[PDB]
Design a protein around this ligand. Structure first.
Ligand SMILES: CC(C)(COP(=O)(O)OP(=O)(O)OC[C@H]1O[C@@H](n2cnc3c(N)ncnc32)[C@H](O)[C@@H]1OP(=O)(O)O)[C@@H](O)C(=O)NCCC(=O)NCCS
Length: 149
């Protein structure tokens, strides 16, 4: 699918209802949490960003971003990654993560995330599976660079 990945500078300029509905249906709170908490965690400051994938008809097909990982130094957390069920398996998640990773590694020396359901996806991107309470996957910049330089 042809999508464009855009930085969210104005949350109120997108129709989020489809993403909210589908994610809720599947039992996921991550889109709801992102949007409900957007005054406190706005993804607008230095060291953070939120992206959306837009279809050729400017419908939101996915979201995902990054911000500082609390309590860890030089570490960013990839957050709120979700692709609409009907838009999966067409390379959107990959394009979104590749954009996130490349930008976030300008600020952070390590990226971490928590995903119970998408281990194969994250390992395919180079993340290492870890046994943690707060994180499932991690990637060091040096590893990212080795796969880039
Ligand atoms: C995980 C997720 C972000 C991946 O994004 P995507 O746009 O579907 O992924 P891509 O098309 O870029 O494919 C990259 C990898 O993601 C995985 N993937 C593909 N389709 C998937 C899907 N329907 N569900 C979960 N992972 C999927 C595959 O490992 C794929 O690797 P491959 O192309 O070599 O087969 C997205 O599918 C999602 O938000 N999934 C929700 C969780 C989920 O699907 N749970 C399991 C089913 S209920």
């Amino acid at each position: 699918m042809d999508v464009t990945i855009e930085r969210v500078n104005d949350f109120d300029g997108y129709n989020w209802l489809p993403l909210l509905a589908k994610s809720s249906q599947e039992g996921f709170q991550l889109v709801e949490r992102m949007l409900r908490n957007r005054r406190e965690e706005s993804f607008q400051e230095d060291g953070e960003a939120m992206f959306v994938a837009l279809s050729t008809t400017n419908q939101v097909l996915a979201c995902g971003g990054y911000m500082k990982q609390s309590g860890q130094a030089r570490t960013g957390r990839i957050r709120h990654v979700y692709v609409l069920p009907e838009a999966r398996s067409h390379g959107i998640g990959t394009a979104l993560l590749e954009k996130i990773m490349s930008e976030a590694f300008l600020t952070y020396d390590r990226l971490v995330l928590y995903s119970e359901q998408a281990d194969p996806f994250y390992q395919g991107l180079g993340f290492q599976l870890v046994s943690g309470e707060k994180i499932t996957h991690t990637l060091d910049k040096t590893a990212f660079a080795d796969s880039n330089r």
